[PDB]
Design a protein around this nucleic acid. Structure first.
Ligand SMILES: [Mg+2]
Ligand SMILES: [Zn+2]
Ligand SMILES: [Zn+2]
Ligand SMILES: [Zn+2]
Lengths: 126, 52, 123, 477, 171, 274, 78, 90
RNA sequence: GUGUGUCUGGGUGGUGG
């Protein structure tokens, strides 16, 4: 019943704020570090480290400064947080690829401006 | 009174339908009679004696 | 002819009636005693609400049914297969276990048989 | 049980919608076969459908996988060839019928009118009261809409006669047709909730059938199942007659008998109409008879019910006991038990109580472990089972000093049931101090008394703090 | 996918933990309980590092336990439709392609793929491999694929993915 | 032929200006339904019957297999074609494809384990398939044999089963054990079997190959007569009294005294039989 | 602002003794030095006299609000 | 005098003379379940079903039928665990 | 080298406090 093209979300999931793949990578790293700093905890589950290394493989950035900067720039335009995180994790090579990737983008943003921000985030990629 | 009823269809060819003494009651069996009822089946009466 | 031995009776847990799961009647059938309406009146007069709750609900016929949260109808629960469905309003998640006397479930089921919908909700 | 346990904040009442009943019933396609079984096999679609509940002890349900105790039963439904008046909502049916238009199917007084809006605004807030004033003011003749004059509705048993003053027998089909097209706002201002009680739902197009828990069997059969058999036999006869015979008089007679059968299933105390008298020489016990009586369901099983952990024996005097003490026979104390929670403080004592067994009086009966399992001590379990650990619950026999509630009928006033402390005594009578004979109004000429053993420590503490004999020497009356 | 969404959980606490470290025991119990769920909707949970507040401890009548309703922002694992996610593959069957996202075992059907990719069982690793090795779909490589479906079976979190769109993979 | 269409099955429309619209069946009728299903964001009501319509379940849901080779299996199908339908099931790992005729939402469920039944007074078995139509129970030699509820002659399990091994370990009912050797040995298992030389290994996983194994227990590693007899009390305060023992323990016994209504519990050392 | 009576009713005492006894029964840590008493009820009464019962009583006002009162905050009936 | 006063006030708190019968007691908005417990259980329940009357479960009788702790004496309040007071424990 | 099914549903009469 849920659909991304119309950008329709349930009542609960709409109000939430989406965080990037690098963001969950950083939070998982902090959680793992304080787990190493924990007060004699039990062994962790396979699902946690599985997701952790999956986010590690999906990672494109490692420094928090760039993450803060890209989060600052990406909220300037009316780009929804789900497609924002999708673009941050994906980062294709042209605007048409982004348009064909998420079908909600079609019509909302012109190809020129979308290609501009795509080239900008690709230059900011390290 | 030990009474068993057969089942229509091993270890359990019959079902036990025995009559037991009343749970709160005790006594000495003092008179047991066996006879035939009106229609010819076996019919028994057992008198239990309890000194109070 | 009246003796104490023919009148003494005790019951802790034993047989129950078939229709409602409350204890049976009589000491010949080992049934236990009736906590009647005036006993309930005296217990609320004490204010011993917990003792009254235990006597009526817990000490007689404890039971628990799963009820849907949307509509107040009892939902199908398959605990071993670990699925709970309120077939009738297309719900499988908003199901809540509710502790009630078996007599209350019986009464609500006959009311449902009478076309009355005793929609019970935890909201 | 993976569902969140919670209390009931409120109970909403209403009328089950026919489509809701259809999508609620486990019996897809309805119940069509009066026969309860086929050669001993429980027939699906019959009156002992295995989907509805559990056929026999140690049997499993089909709708759920619960056993006899676990399964709370599931409902079936019968699709009726023709609708019928629900005898219970009959007077409500007449009142709504006279309130609304026969032909226009609109309110006899328009809601849009400002003065009528003011009249209902005085009565907004209460549905039954609003319906009462609406009925009182219509008690009009003509509708606005069409100016056809409304008839007068009269009842003769179960059928409805519409008298224009051509007197016609108002069939339930026509009433359902009238009620179907009434608007929801008209329903609300009429005094009925459109969400829960739509006008077209009192007329029985679909008859619910209860689970097997409501109508249990031994191979005797509950009379409710007998009425269901009669209803479904008449319903199948009506279906065949509509399909094949199509004679209006036999259809009308069958519909009259169907109305009689469903009404007698609901209420078997109709004046004038025949009693649903069985072939056994015994009148029926309908649902209304199940609920209404003092020995019925509400007053007989909900408000007051038979309880476990209770004793009764005659009472005799005993001046040596204190007023708050009660003598208890050995057998009575050895029979009922108080579930004690195992602690390291009492682990050794409770282990000894377990070891002594149920045979000797100062012993125990059950051991409820932490997992909810109980082990009986009459079966002589292995000592590995008898090893107690903290958190277990041991159902020790009633020892001295135990708090009991001591009740004598008739329970007139607050002192009719009082907390007492147990003192074990040889003979078979409860013993009382002579002072407590006055609050109980108890004599010693064969008086019996009812003992109650509170099972939880919370209940014991509240009886100790509220209902003990010293705490209630002075009465507030 | 990764939403910082509030989640509500109820903690049933034994009275033995009613000590000086009562609330610490509450937090530890919440961490131990909430992690690893495979319920149909909410699924896997990532909320160890975040708590909003712990509600008041209501003593249930007749039971020793206590209710601690804890509000906290959490990270959910739920299915969705019409979006494409970076993925890494797992062990692949002959006709059906098994890909993995975190611990979620995704699936792909054979004929839904465009014809530029076909299975080659004669290849030594049994996996979706192209003839020209242009894009190799095998265990532990970076790819892209979309998800439209949702699946539940006896509280085992499941889904089916699709790759009808072209040009996806190392992008 | 017959038109055996089930509620819960989805259909598709071929003709008209309403092509490729899928909706969930909400009611069932004999031949002419004129149903009003919930299509995908359709604001217009369509009343079209089931005669032309074909049974195609929607995207990603789970279906059940009634007939065919996968009889009673739950399948999940994602394919839109007339004669090609593909599934990944739970009983079967090796991928085969099943016909849409054997796909609906029937109540045959093959998701299941460990239920105990008796075939001999001593020998027991572990069931693998939990169905109302085929009770298939494994046997230790590595086969599958069908049984029935009325053909099994159910006997209550005795909880005195203490299986024991050669590594000098100690294990009872509801215990996890391991084996040093085995293809899929070394996993969690629940042991409830009444014998001393053999013990079954338990898995709730796929039941074809990697969910059952057994080998001999040499390699496993860790992690009354007095009732009714007439007795004479020859000692103690109750000396000389005559009774019949009702409940007899190893130490004490309960005696139904003939001379009095009381039933006393006396030690067996003070009981002398007739 | 709390306006309910500072005294603690017999019903409040009965309930708080019962639940404190139930808590001590399943090995909740005590709040008073024990002379050696065993049953939870007498120990709970000892805590009550010591005013060391760690339970907040939420008195529900008829208007739907409430007033949380600690057992230490209330005054013993005896 | 308190019990006489309470009887008189209860049966005169609605303006009219509330007779202690089926005719006075069951006409108030006390709730369908309490009224059904008192008298004419079937009539009250059918009227409630017709009018969609909801029972707010604020009386003792309703909670007694549903088996829940009544709003009576030992159930007219809640108990909350004083977590701060638990910090003195050992 | 073990172990739970305990004839329900009505009616009539008598009796105890
Ligand atoms: Mg008298
Ligand atoms: Zn529902
Ligand atoms: Zn069932
Ligand atoms: Zn009109």
């Amino acid at each position: 019943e849920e659909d991304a093209s119309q950008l329709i979300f349930p009542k609960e999931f709409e109000t939430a704020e989406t965080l990037l793949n690098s963001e969950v990578h950083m939070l998982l790293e902090h959680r793992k570090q304080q787990n190493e700093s924990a007060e004699d905890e039990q062994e962790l589950s396979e699902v946690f480290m599985k997701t952790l290394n999956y986010t590690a493989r999906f990672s494109r950035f490692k420094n928090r400064e760039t993450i803060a900067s890209v989060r600052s720039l990406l909220l300037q335009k009316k780009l929804h947080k789900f497609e924002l995180a999708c673009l941050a994790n994906l980062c294709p090579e042209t605007a048409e690829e982004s348009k064909a990737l998420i079908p909600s983008l079609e019509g909302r943003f012109e190809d020129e401006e979308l290609q501009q921000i795509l080239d900008d985030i690709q230059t900011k990629r390290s | 009174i030990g009474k068993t009823v057969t089942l229509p269809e091993r270890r359990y060819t019959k079902r036990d339908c025995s009559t037991f003494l009343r749970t709160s009651e005790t006594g000495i069996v003092d008179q047991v009679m066996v006879t035939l009822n009106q229609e010819g089946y076996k019919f028994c009466k057992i008198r239990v004696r309890s000194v109070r | 002819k009246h003796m104490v031995d023919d009148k003494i009776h005790s019951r802790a847990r034993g047989p129950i009636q078939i229709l409602n799961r409350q204890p049976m009647e009589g000491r010949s059938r080992d049934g236990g005693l009736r906590f009647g309406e005036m006993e309930r009146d005296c217990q609320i007069a004490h204010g011993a609400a917990q003792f009254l709750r235990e006597r009526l609900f817990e000490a007689s016929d404890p039971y628990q049914v799963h009820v849907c949260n949307l509509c107040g109808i009892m939902a199908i629960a398959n605990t071993r297969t670990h699925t709970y469905e309120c077939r009738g309003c297309r719900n499988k998640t908003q199901i809540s276990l509710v502790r009630m006397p078996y007599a209350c479930k019986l009464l609500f089921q006959e009311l449902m048989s009478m076309s009355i919908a005793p929609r019970m909700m935890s909201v | 049980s993976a569902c969140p346990l919670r209390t009931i904040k409120r109970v909403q009442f209403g009328v089950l919608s026919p489509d809701e009943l259809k999508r609620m019933s486990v019996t897809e396609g309805g119940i069509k076969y009066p026969e309860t079984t086929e050669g001993g096999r429980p027939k699906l679609g019959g009156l002992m459908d295995p989907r509805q509940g559990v056929i026999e002890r140690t049997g499993r349900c089909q709708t759920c996988a619960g056993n006899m105790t676990e399964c709370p039963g599931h409902f079936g439904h019968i699709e009726l060839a023709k609708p019928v008046f629900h005898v219970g909502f009959l007077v409500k049916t007449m009142k709504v019928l006279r309130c609304v238009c026969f032909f226009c199917s609109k309110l006899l007084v328009d809601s849009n009118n400002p003065k009528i809006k003011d009249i209902l605004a005085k009565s907004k807030g209460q549905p039954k009261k609003r319906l009462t004033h609406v009925y009182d003011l219509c008690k009009k003749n003509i509708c606005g809409g069409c100016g056809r004059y409304q008839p007068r509705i009269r009842r003769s048993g179960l059928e409805l006669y519409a008298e224009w003053k051509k007197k016609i027998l108002l069939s339930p089909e026509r009433v359902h047709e009238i009620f179907k097209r009434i608007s929801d706002e008209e329903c609300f201002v009429l005094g009925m909730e459109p969400r829960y009680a739509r006008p077209e739902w009192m007329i029985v197009t679909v008859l619910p059938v209860p689970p097997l828990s409501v109508r249990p069997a031994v191979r005797n059969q509950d009379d409710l199942t007998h009425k269901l058999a009669d209803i479904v036999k008449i319903n199948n006869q009506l279906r065949r007659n509509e399909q094949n015979g199509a004679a209006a008089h036999v259809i009308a007679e069958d519909v009259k008998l169907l109305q009689f059968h469903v009404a007698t299933m609901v209420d078997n105390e109709l004046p004038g109409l025949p009693r649903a008298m069985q072939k056994s020489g015994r009148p029926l016990k309908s649902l209304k008879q199940r609920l209404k009586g003092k020995e019925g369901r509400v007053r007989g099983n909900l408000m007051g019910k038979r309880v476990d952990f209770s004793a009764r024996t005659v009472i005799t005097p005993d001046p040596n006991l204190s007023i708050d003490q009660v003598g208890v026979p050995r057998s009575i104390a050895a029979n009922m038990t108080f579930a004690e929670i195992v602690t390291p403080f009492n682990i050794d004592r409770l282990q000894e109580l377990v070891r002594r067994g149920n045979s000797q009086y100062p012993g125990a009966k059950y051991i409820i472990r932490d997992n909810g399992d109980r082990i009986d001590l009459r079966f002589h379990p292995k000592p590995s089972d008898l090893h107690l650990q903290t958190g277990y619950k041991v159902e020790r026999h009633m020892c001295d000093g135990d708090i009991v509630i001591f009740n004598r009928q008739p329970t007139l006033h607050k002192m009719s049931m009082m907390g007492h402390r147990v003192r074990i005594l040889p003979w078979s009578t409860f013993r009382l101090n002579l002072s407590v004979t006055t609050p109980y109004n108890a004599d010693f000429d064969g008086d019996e008394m009812n003992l109650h053993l509170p099972q939880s420590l919370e209940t014991r503490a509240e009886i100790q703090e509220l209902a003990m004999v010293p705490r209630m020497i002075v009465t507030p009356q | 996918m990764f939403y910082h969404i509030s989640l509500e959980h109820e903690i049933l606490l034994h009275p033995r933990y009613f000590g000086p470290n009562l609330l610490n025991t509450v937090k530890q119990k919440l961490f131990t309980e909430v992690e690893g769920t495979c319920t149909g909707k909410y699924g896997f949970v990532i909320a160890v590092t975040t708590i909003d507040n712990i509600g008041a401890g209501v003593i249930q009548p007749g039971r020793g336990f206590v209710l601690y309703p804890v509000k906290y922002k959490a990270i959910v694992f739920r299915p969705f439709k019409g979006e494409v996610v970076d993925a890494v593959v797992t062990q692949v069957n002959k006709v059906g392609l098994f890909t993995e996202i975190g611990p979620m075992s995704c699936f792909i059907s054979r004929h839904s793929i465009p014809s530029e990719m076909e299975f080659d069982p004669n290849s030594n690793p049994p996996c979706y491999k192209t003839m020209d090795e242009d894009i190799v779909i095998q265990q532990d490589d970076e790819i892209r694929l979309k998800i439209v479906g949702t699946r539940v079976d006896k509280n085992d979190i499941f889904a089916i993915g699709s790759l009808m769109d072209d040009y996806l993979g190392l992008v | 032929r017959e038109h055996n269409f089930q509620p819960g099955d989805n259909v598709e429309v071929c003709e008209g200006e309403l092509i490729n619209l899928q909706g969930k069946i909400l009611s069932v009728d004999g031949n002419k339904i004129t149903i009003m299903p919930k299509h995908e964001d359709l604001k217009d009501m369509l009343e079209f019957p089931a005669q032309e319509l074909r049974k195609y379940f929607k995207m990603g849901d789970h279906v059940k297999v009634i007939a065919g080779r996968f009889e009673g299996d739950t399948g999940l199908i994602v394919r839109v074609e007339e004669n090609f339908v593909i599934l990944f099931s739970d009983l079967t790992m090796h991928e085969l494809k099943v016909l849409p005729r054997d796909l609906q939402l029937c109540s045959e469920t093959a998701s299941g384990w460990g239920e105990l039944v008796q075939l001999d007074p001593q020998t027991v078995g572990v069931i693998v398939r939990l169905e109302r139509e085929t009770f298939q129970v494994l046997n230790m030699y590595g086969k599958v044999v069908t049984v029935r509820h009325q053909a099994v002659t159910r006997k209550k399990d005795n909880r005195f089963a203490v299986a024991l091994d050669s590594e000098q370990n100690n294990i009872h009912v509801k215990d996890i054990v391991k084996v040093i050797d085995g293809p899929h040995s070394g996993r969690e298992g629940e042991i409830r079997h009444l014998f001393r030389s053999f013990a079954f290994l338990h898995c709730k996983k796929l039941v074809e190959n990697g969910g059952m194994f057994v080998c001999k227990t040499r390699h496993l590693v860790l992690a009354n007569e007095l009732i009714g007899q007439t007795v004479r009390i020859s000692q103690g305060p109750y000396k000389g009294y005559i009774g019949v023992v009702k409940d007899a323990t190893e130490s004490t016994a309960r005696v139904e005294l003939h001379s009095t209504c009381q039933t006393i519990s006396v030690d067996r050392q003070r009981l002398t039989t007739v | 602002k709390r306006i309910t009576t500072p005294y603690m009713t017999k019903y409040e005492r009965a309930r708080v003794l019962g639940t404190r006894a139930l808590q001590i029964a399943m090995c909740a840590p005590v709040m008073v030095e024990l002379e050696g008493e065993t049953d939870p009820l007498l120990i709970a009464m000892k805590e009550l006299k010591a005013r060391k019962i760690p339970i907040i009583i939420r008195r529900y006002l008829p208007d739907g609000s409430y007033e949380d009162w600690g057992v230490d905050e209330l005054i013993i009936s005896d | 005098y308190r019990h006489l006063a309470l009887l008189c006030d209860t049966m005169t708190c609605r303006g009219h003379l509330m007779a202690i019968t089926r005719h006075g007691v069951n006409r108030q908005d006390t709730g369908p379940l309490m009224k059904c417990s008192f008298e004419e259980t079937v009539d009250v329940l059918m009227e409630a079903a017709a009018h969609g009357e909801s029972d707010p479960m604020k009386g003792v009788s309703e909670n007694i039928m549903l088996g829940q702790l009544a709003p009576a004496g030992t159930g007219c309040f809640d108990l909350l665990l004083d977590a701060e007071k638990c910090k003195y424990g050992m």
